[PDB]
């Protein structure tokens, strides 16, 4: 929002766009929470996909998505991504 006072002492809101919403936190956590889609999905993709991102990007990825070096699951790329998808689907209707 912005209020303009350029007509002497007469004021007038030049423009205002009002955003109102609730229930964002559950989706925020289902995307980036402990069981969120992004952390597990990125971890599985990094484990099953050859090659590592530059070290600078690697630090951020480890910090945010909790990439794990070693996994004992002979489950494949498809199941690795699909576990994250499954938990996200449960996240969707398990909350607001």
37 in Cβ contact with 31 (< 8 Å): yes
- Alpha-carbon separation of residue 31 from 19, 26, 35, 87 (angstroms): 21, 9, 8, 10
Taking the C-alpha atoms of residue 13 and residue 5, their distance in angstroms, rounded to an integer, is 8
Q: Which two tokens stand for residue 66?
A: 């909790």
- Looking only at the bridges linking them, the beta strands covering 10-15 and 2-7 are antiparallel
User: Resolution, rounded to a tenth of an Å?
Assistant: 9.0
DSSP 23-59: -HHHHHHHHHSTT-HHHHHHHHHHHHSSS---HHHHH
End-to-end CA distance of the chain: 29
Residues in Cβ contact with 36 at an 8 Å cutoff, skipping those fewer than 6 apart: 29, 30, 88, 91
Q: Which two tokens stand for residue 3?
A: 């209020």
Residues in Cβ contact with 26 at an 8 Å cutoff, skipping those fewer than 6 apart: 91, 95, 96
96 in Cβ contact with 81 (< 8 Å): no
37 in Cβ contact with 88 (< 8 Å): yes
At residue 2, the 3 state secondary structure works out as strand
């Amino acid at each position: 929002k912005t209020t303009l006072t350029a007509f002497g002492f007469a004021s007038a809101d030049l423009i205002e766009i009002g955003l109102e919403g609730k229930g964002f936190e559950p989706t925020l956590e289902a995307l980036f929470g402990k069981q969120g889609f992004f952390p597990d999905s990125v971890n599985k993709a990094l484990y099953w996909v050859n090659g590592q991102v530059p070290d600078g990007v690697s630090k951020v990825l480890v910090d945010h998505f909790g990439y794990t070096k070693d996994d004992k699951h002979e489950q494949d790329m498809v199941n690795g991504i699909m576990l994250s998808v499954e938990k996200l689907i449960k996240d969707l209707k398990s909350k607001e």
